[PDB]
Symmetry: C3
Subunit: 215 residues, 3 copies
């Protein structure tokens, strides 16, 4: 039964880690909230998305100091996943939450991805077409609306050539990195972008670790 | 004995050569259930109604003229399909080792590679638009409800669909050869393994139903 | 430290092979130049791109005999990379240069790819949307314009259903085939197109080598 030792060790490891992480998510104090980020974006969902980005980043650093990356650690990184292409401006990220500014300047679309995280996007500009699984009709969302991509749900997304939004996710963030980097490995082969994504995600983790040490 | 390093290589070449003649001889001596004109005619008769109403009447007509070969309503579900760079959904009605009939379409604007496989495929558009770009050309053609696109064996084209395109599709050949292309984006791009499970689920039910019909006959 | 011998040989092998190629590219006599191809393509940037294809091939074979493939060795080969799909007509190709006619008859777009080659495209018809890295707005280019994709640059490309262009690239051409065939391996699995791409690239390499033997 020695050959089965490896198979038992992974099943026991996955079952223990599944209860360890799920019990952590149900007992962890969270920094941001899905309604908090959506409300913040709706305050400026009339202005220019560049003007909205500035006022949103300023308001986030006031209400949650020590949790948003500095302007020195901010950069627009391309994101290739599920067949669509966009760019992100990661403001905050931990092992359980993340807040970023996502959007695209071209017409893209594809698979939303199925992972262990609840994702909410509040559109600031452009349009957002969503196709839920098992249906034959899609819905188009406009600036001001908030789309909630629930955990375990898989939909089809599509954006116009000027769509920008504010996004908040909660769950187990590392579970999404397999889907977020799939097209970067097998399609674009833009390993420099792969480096940028790990770079800014590590800075957000080190910043979050630095805040817990001071408290 | 130089045949030791070549033992795996010869067995695969011998295995492929034996399997190639056994499958191609089967396709030339097997009685087929459906017909390429039969599915296309049935879909074109309902290409003026709403595609949801057309789906219902086509499934009824298929179960009337071909009982025991179309899945029951309990075993039907819309499964996402990501392949060649496009994304849609299918409703597998019938499928065997040599034929398959399903309802495919998309609610978004997608497009990509049609895939090159060992199966002749015909699609009759019920709604939306269908742009096809054949290999070796510099211009594309747009197909409208009522038209039928024939994707011959070994042909590779570029496909593109509008945000409301739905169609009835029939394929004949060696169906397992197409599953390698149908699941490529599901493995390397979307990683939606639950959809991968659904595809294997609905394709197995169609095989078990078709096998269940052969046992009673 | 015995197992680190392979790792040192790889670091020394990659660093030395980088110096030899980069120093070769910076001191090598080239056949074509981007301004030569750009002027030739801009003169024929009209509506009838098929007539433009013929007139460009004739002019290229006059001023550069023995460097452009004959009509017998020409075929339109599909190109799937970065999420977009088009077709190419390889006219000239070496280890450092290539001249081809690229375009698409459908609406595609995706990652431009980051590789070791400077690429310039002069639009003959259609439209070309380029989304530079780190920005939030994209630009649309029209027939007559020339887009220069420099080495190490990564952008988002998008084309309309009638875009055709003349392209010239210079750098390390074998480094670009890894990106050009990525989607063909992991998405389309069109092994026949993979054969066509290697076939026409081999004929173009053998043609360029055949001219060096006669000279
Ligand atoms: O930044 C992202 O992409 C937002 C776009 N959204 C739009 C629709 O819902 C899913 C993704 C993701 C990320 C990237 C990098 C770090 C952490 C997260 C979010 C997880 C899924 C994709 C990659
Ligand atoms: O369900 C499909 O996709 C329909 C779309 N049509 C549209 C364009 O031409 C090819 C397929 C396919 C399938 C997948 C799995 C089982 C049975 C069939 C058909 C074969 C080629 C792709 C995958
Ligand atoms: O032929 C091509 O594709 C042109 C399309 N362009 C359009 C935008 O910029 C990058 C590619 C490429 C090639 C393929 C085969 C041989 C030599 C070159 C050029 C390098 C990058 C992709 C593949
Ligand atoms: C590649 C083909 C694109 C079609 C050209 C017309 C539309 C492109 O124009 C786009 O319109 C949007 C507002 O409407 C803007 O947000 C985009 O920045 C602009 O590029
Ligand atoms: Au930024
Ligand atoms: Au920003
Ligand atoms: Au269904
Ligand atoms: Au159905
Ligand atoms: Au050609
Ligand atoms: Au040509």
């Amino acid at each position: 039964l020695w050959l089965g030792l490896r198979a038992v060790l992974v099943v026991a490891g996955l079952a223990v880690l599944l209860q360890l992480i799920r019990g952590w998510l149900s007992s962890k104090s969270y920094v941001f909230n899905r309604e908090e980020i959506a409300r913040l974006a709706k305050e400026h969902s009339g202005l220019d998305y560049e003007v909205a980005f500035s006022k949103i980043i300023v308001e986030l650093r006031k209400k949650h100091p020590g949790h948003i990356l500095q302007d020195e650690d901010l950069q627009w990184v391309f994101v290739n996943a599920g067949g669509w292409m966009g760019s992100m401006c990661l403001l905050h990220a931990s092992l359980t939450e993340y807040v970023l500014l996502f959007g695209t300047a071209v017409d893209t679309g594809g698979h939303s991805g199925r992972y262990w995280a609840e994702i909410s996007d509040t559109i600031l500009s452009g349009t957002f077409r969503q196709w839920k699984e098992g249906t034959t009709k899609s819905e188009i969302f406009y600036p001001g609306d908030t789309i909630v991509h629930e955990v375990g749900e898989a939909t089809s997304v599509q954006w116009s050539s000027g769509t920008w939004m504010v996004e908040y996710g909660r769950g187990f963030i590392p579970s999404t990195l397999a889907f977020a980097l799939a097209d970067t490995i097998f399609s674009t082969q833009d390993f420099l972008t792969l480096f940028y994504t790990v770079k800014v995600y590590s800075k957000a983790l080190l910043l979050e670790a630095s805040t817990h040490l001071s408290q």
